[PDB]
UniProtKB/Swiss-Prot annotation:
Disulfide bridge positions per record: none
Superkingdom of the source species: Eukaryota
Signal peptide: none
UniProt: Ca(2+) 4 binding residues: 126, 128, 130, 132, 137
Protein name: Calcium-dependent protein kinase SK5
Length: 182
């Protein structure tokens, strides 16, 4: 052939194997990260599984050349959500501001959540009390409790509560189907 891929832009097809450089030509939960953590970028697990359900068109814990590009063009724009929001969306499924062990452990279906280990995890991730994770807990569960407004943990992290947002913004999307047409 003389024209089929998008090699004109940049080594993207390679960018795909650029990730699964040790697997076999597929991106699994492990290589999901291994790939971008190579170019310098640094994401957390939650981001991996977040990209699997939110980007992996065939969330099977493995991304192929196809699922790659569809998941690459997503991060290829003017988007901003490389923070806690990654899990805050999946982990904090209800996105109310907290995650009770139910939503926490549940979000770990691949972790084989158990009453032995993942159970202690309730208390292992529980940064303030209820074996739950809130925008603040999920925040202190990896970092610390800064004195800046950034705080969001449950009313116990200090003494004060928290300031309410001014409003949520969103772009939205439409209904499109692709398969035999490109
Ligand atoms: Ca791989
Ligand atoms: Ca797949
Ligand atoms: Ca919630
Ligand atoms: Ca808690």
């Amino acid at each position: 052939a003389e024209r089929l891929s998008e090699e004109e832009i940049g080594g993207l097809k390679e960018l795909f194997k650029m990730i699964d450089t040790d697997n076999s030509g597929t991106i699994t939960f492990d290589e999901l990260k291994d790939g971008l953590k190579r170019v310098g970028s640094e994401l957390m697990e939650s981001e991996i599984k977040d990209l699997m359900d939110a980007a992996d068109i065939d969330k099977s814990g493995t991304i192929d050349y196809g699922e790659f590009i569809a998941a690459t063009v997503h991060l290829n724009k003017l988007e901003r959500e490389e923070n806690l929001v990654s899990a805050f969306s999946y982990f904090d499924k209800d996105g109310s501001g907290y995650i009770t062990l139910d939503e926490i452990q549940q979000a770990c279906k691949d972790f084989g959540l158990d009453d032995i280990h993942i159970d202690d995890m309730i208390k292992e991730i529980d940064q303030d009390n209820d074996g739950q994770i809130d925008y603040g807990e999920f925040a202190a569960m990896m970092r610390k409790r800064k004195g800046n407004g950034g705080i969001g943990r449950r009313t116990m992290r200090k003494t004060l509560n928290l300031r309410d947002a001014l409003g949520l913004v969103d772009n939205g999307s439409n209904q499109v189907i692709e398969g035999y047409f490109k």
